[PDB]
Design a protein around this ligand. Sequence first.
Ligand SMILES: CC(=O)N[C@H]1[C@@H](OP(=O)(O)OP(=O)(O)OC[C@H]2O[C@@H](n3ccc(=O)[nH]c3=O)[C@H](O)[C@@H]2O)O[C@H](CO)[C@@H](O)[C@@H]1O
Ligand SMILES: CC(=O)N[C@H]1[C@@H](OP(=O)(O)OP(=O)(O)OC[C@H]2O[C@@H](n3ccc(=O)[nH]c3=O)[C@H](O)[C@@H]2O)O[C@H](CO)[C@@H](O)[C@@H]1O
Ligand SMILES: O=C[C@H](O)[C@@H](O)[C@H](O)[C@H](O)COP(=O)(O)O
Ligand SMILES: O=C[C@H](O)[C@@H](O)[C@H](O)[C@H](O)COP(=O)(O)O
Ligand SMILES: N[C@@H](CCC(=O)O)C(=O)O
Ligand SMILES: [Mg+2]
Ligand SMILES: [Mg+2]
Lengths: 654, 649
Amino acid sequence: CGIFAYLNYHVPRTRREILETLIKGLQRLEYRGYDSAGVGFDGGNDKDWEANACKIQLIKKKGKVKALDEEVHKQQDMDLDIEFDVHLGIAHTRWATHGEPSPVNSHPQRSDKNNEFIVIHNGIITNYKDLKKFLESKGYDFESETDTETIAKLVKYMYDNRESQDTSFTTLVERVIQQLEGAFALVFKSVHFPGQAVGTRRGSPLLIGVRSEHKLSTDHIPILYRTTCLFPVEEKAVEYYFASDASAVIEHTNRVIFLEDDDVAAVVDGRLSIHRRAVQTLQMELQQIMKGNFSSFMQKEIFEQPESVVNTMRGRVNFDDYTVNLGGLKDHIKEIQRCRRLILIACGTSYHAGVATRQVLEELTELPVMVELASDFLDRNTPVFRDDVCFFLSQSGETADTLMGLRYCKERGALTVGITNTVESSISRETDCGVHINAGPEIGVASTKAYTSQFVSLVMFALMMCDDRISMQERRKEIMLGLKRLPDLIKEVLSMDDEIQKLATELYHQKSVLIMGRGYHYATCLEGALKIKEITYMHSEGILAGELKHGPLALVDKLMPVIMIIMRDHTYAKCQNALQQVVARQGRPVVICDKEDTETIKNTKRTIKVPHSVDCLQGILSVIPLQLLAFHLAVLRGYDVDFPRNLAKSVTVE
Amino acid sequence: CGIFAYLNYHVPRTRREILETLIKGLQRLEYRGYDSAGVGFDGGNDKDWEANACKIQLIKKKGKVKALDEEVHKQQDMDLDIEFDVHLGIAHTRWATHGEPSPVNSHPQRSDKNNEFIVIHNGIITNYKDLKKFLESKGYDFESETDTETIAKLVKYMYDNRESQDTSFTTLVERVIQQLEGAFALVFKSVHFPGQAVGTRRGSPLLIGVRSEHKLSTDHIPILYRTTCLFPVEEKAVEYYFASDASAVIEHTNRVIFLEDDDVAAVVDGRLSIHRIHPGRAVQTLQMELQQIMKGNFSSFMQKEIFEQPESVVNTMRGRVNFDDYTVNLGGLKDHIKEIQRCRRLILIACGTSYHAGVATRQVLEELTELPVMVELASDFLDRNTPVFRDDVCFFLSQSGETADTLMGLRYCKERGALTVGITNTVESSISRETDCGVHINAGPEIGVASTKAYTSQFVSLVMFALMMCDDRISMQERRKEIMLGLKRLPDLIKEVLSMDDEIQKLATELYHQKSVLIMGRGYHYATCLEGALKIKEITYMHSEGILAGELKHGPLALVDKLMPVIMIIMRDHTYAKCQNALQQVVARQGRPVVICDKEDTETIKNTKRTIKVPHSVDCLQGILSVIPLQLLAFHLAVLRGYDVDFPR
Ligand SMILES: CC(=O)N[C@H]1[C@@H](OP(=O)(O)OP(=O)(O)OC[C@H]2O[C@@H](n3ccc(=O)[nH]c3=O)[C@H](O)[C@@H]2O)O[C@H](CO)[C@@H](O)[C@@H]1O
Ligand SMILES: CC(=O)N[C@H]1[C@@H](OP(=O)(O)OP(=O)(O)OC[C@H]2O[C@@H](n3ccc(=O)[nH]c3=O)[C@H](O)[C@@H]2O)O[C@H](CO)[C@@H](O)[C@@H]1O
Ligand SMILES: O=C[C@H](O)[C@@H](O)[C@H](O)[C@H](O)COP(=O)(O)O
Ligand SMILES: O=C[C@H](O)[C@@H](O)[C@H](O)[C@H](O)COP(=O)(O)O
Ligand SMILES: N[C@@H](CCC(=O)O)C(=O)O
Ligand SMILES: [Mg+2]
Ligand SMILES: [Mg+2]
């Protein structure tokens, strides 16, 4: 899901300029959810804007943001020429994992038929049933099946039972959050508090971006408890930007305030305070969240892996003297080496990054390495000990299951390490240490550069662990020479784009495809099969090549598409046996192999020839063809690679 | 692939009776698969059986034993009524590796056009190229494209170049295997050693059954190097059954000797000795009956081994679970359970369905041992050179006990000093022998192509081990009671699941025309999804895939629409609510799944159209009940589609 709100204070904006900023804010957040959307703003057509704050208008529609943008426009009642000197608009794209993605279930949710209170919510209220029964007994009727509605019906209940005639908007929200359970990131708007916004969170991201041509009073808002607020000094002109993601705010400003749990932020009279701290400068650049010259974000993020790989190693690898220094681990690396086991915990593609680096981690650390799916890790109550080092791989740093695993391991005294791509995420904060893979914002739902950057990051960690072993010095040099050559070799793989598109035209009409690999390329066939599932909707399954003889080989015939990965490492001969078994079953497989593997290239009709690299790095090169293959298969089938069906990016809830 | 030989010594048999025995022996070996078969016996029609030992006849044919049996009873100039007081007949079923299936390539292979030496072989001689060249340079002409023929030619070379006139048959075979490389199970017969048999193995099973109405000289045959042998005491009558599988012996006798690598067993003057280059080979009693390898009233071995799972689960627990005082005792682990309890990690290593048996019990093992439990695919385990340590307990799950990758993982772990434990279903298999200890799951022989009873018997065996590991913990007494009471009720609950066969058949009709099916579960039923999807792959040849329910929203949920068949497993355990979310996620995307749920789950049944309702059991045993409907689904789909469930692919 995604949250965005635009508050202009004495910065005159027409009703058209405000709605465009709300839609433009959702378009930046659409990748977090695109099953429905909605906006909230003041209605009325009075030339005097002050006589319009008492009327709230809601425009919600099922579909992507482009469906809501069309609903906002070509409306016969809303005059888009009214000028608002002060106004508050809220918007929200929704990932509907349950029920229907109808306008009634979209946000903002309202408290009554006159829209006295509207709220946009990211998360789940684990006790909305009790709140619904209670509010229903007090004479409040509901209209939707969402847990968010109990928040709107409750802020009005606190307002309808206020002791004093001038109870601040903050007070009401405080009494609400005290009755809510679970997680939530809320942005309230009420007719009784014109132009005032309240932003609180508890386990859900929420930041406030501020812009103002005038000097700001301070750069470190103090927290209050039941010379204090952030506001322009000499003048009133100021703009605020509530958002659950920094991508929607960077285009307007790079000055944001990262709230924290129970921090109730409020904007009253154009002054921002936080009840119950810093004002940071973001290092993100607008160009990082733009497609540029690519038609989709996924294709850009695939083709920019030569640069993102370099950025992951920038300032961390030194090829002149073959040294590796991860600044985020300097004050912990020595104690990590005294531990006795490594546990890698993640979901989806981030879990595949652990499968892909498990072998080199075992080799260079000589420690047991256990890779776990976070959901299953929690179901089993896996044993964890004080001398365990637990890694948590999360591009977003907010994945619920991975985050719960983190807190599970922390309670048991394990050393927790983060491999994240979001600085102010829950996982990067709550881990004792970690590495920001510095891949850059990932907009495509399917992770591409995050996987390769996680791969490289875990390799760099492995190179630090063995930097004191004489017997492994040459092995480190071999690997670090590969990392030096890796960007150019990735470019060579991307130059085969056309050749991979031709193969896509041979498979797009197929129902299934089996992707087979072993060793360093087990993760490759799992990740390739997952990417094809996600964006092409073909039934692709990754099969460990050594397991074919134990049953799955019965699926192979001349009709079943098969992709095989055969690289020049120590498993080459075993991979040749698997290929021979497939051919014996009349399979006609596409083989991803090494350029110099003349034997495989001679006896196979369709081959994808990637350049040779170090065995523990070849997985980076062998997965990119499957990233591209999934891309071209989706185009041929007429799907949108950026917005696959049935899901969105980052699973921040159950 | 299948070896069988019958040696009657002073037990008169007619040629008809001898041939019927050989054929019946091969009938017990057909289940392994083969492309040809053959028998070797004494030719000639001299009323005196002694003048016929210098003539060996071969009858080999590409096809099935039925065809071979027809060939035997169609030969002219061969009188079947001749009575042999002493005779050695050998038989073979071949799975071709070197050379196409044909009579010349079929076994027994001969040493020359007069059949001075004949041999039957299971395995591959990796250096048959060099051997064939050497023999050809010495004037020996080959006729087949098989590696086996080099063995028959080589034993004659050793005979033609023997130093003394009375060099034993053993000596010749000893000099042959010294020059052989690879894996083999061999049985030799020669006109120069009438009535004598020699058997040897290296990495291939070979055993000898013995029967006699007279007292045998010993039950432990001592070894001899280059009282002393096995034989009836006061009389000569005795029968020997060389075989590569006890299935061909058990109907005649349950007293068998299992050979080991480089043993050379010989029968000379009706007396069995074992030579190498005090230790000896035991004459043990097999707890195996013919009815365990016969279909009976079932139409296939798959159906039999699925529907007899109430009985195999009981056999797995017999003598090991005391429901009177609720204790668990695995005899095979008595002299190791206390050392196992001092180790710090469990590692389960296996392939295929045996691996799923570890996934299915990982959680309860973690719960009751409180130790880390790591479940490894054997092939990947070897590729990574997984770190193993002296205080690791490594388990090796194998129905057959001969799976190469699981066996090589065993030897890898033994090198690292780990304590090794076997969970096997084959006595005297490589994995059971070479592990420090283990448990024979006692499921009975598995004749079907796919693991059915073996999986559920491995499941139960691993649960029993977990119950031993926590038998000293006061805090877990109640949990152990709950589990053991579930093991008590488990056979009847299996019968309850099998009584829903009709409902499973209706589900097979709905999927009859389907090309894919997603099977979704989590927790205790993750393995159920993987195992069910494997059987449907292996038996029905459709693209069934197991998906961890918790991973749906991370990508795979995109496959859900109104056309993709989906089976979901939703039981009443601590993941019930999480499974319900998965169901809502699928339904919301127009998926209409079939649900395997508890018999009493009223909410799920009313909101879902087709539900397979299984009885409720303890959470760590429900995986046995939730997997059987998928076993039956695989069975019925294959039958519907005209496939032979007992035919390997
Ligand atoms: C401020 C910052 O972000 N990084 C600084 C650091 O990068 P540097 O790469 O050294 O530090 P990282 O970005 O990796 O992580 C910053 C801090 O967050 C912690 N952490 C990170 C990820 C995680 O999942 N869990 C976790 O606890 C790290 O332990 C570390 O203490 O030197 C570089 C110099 O050009 C710059 O990038 C920055 O001056
Ligand atoms: C094979 C055998 O004769 N088992 C007898 C044994 O069963 P019991 O249940 O006592 O022991 P098992 O049959 O399971 O195993 C027999 C021996 O082989 C070892 N082993 C087994 C499997 C394995 O994978 N690795 C391994 O090393 C065991 O540690 C044990 O020393 O006593 C029972 C009577 O109480 C008899 O009915 C069984 O016939
Ligand atoms: O292409 C698949 C997606 O990238 C998906 O698998 C994703 O990796 C997880 O749903 C959560 O990943 P993070 O924990 O890294 O956010
Ligand atoms: O239906 C599949 C088979 O049962 C298969 O998966 C089998 O489990 C392994 O190929 C080897 O198993 P064993 O090591 O137990 O013989
Ligand atoms: N390798 C031998 C024997 C194979 C077997 O039956 O196992 C052959 O092909 O004749
Ligand atoms: Mg931190
Ligand atoms: Mg043993």
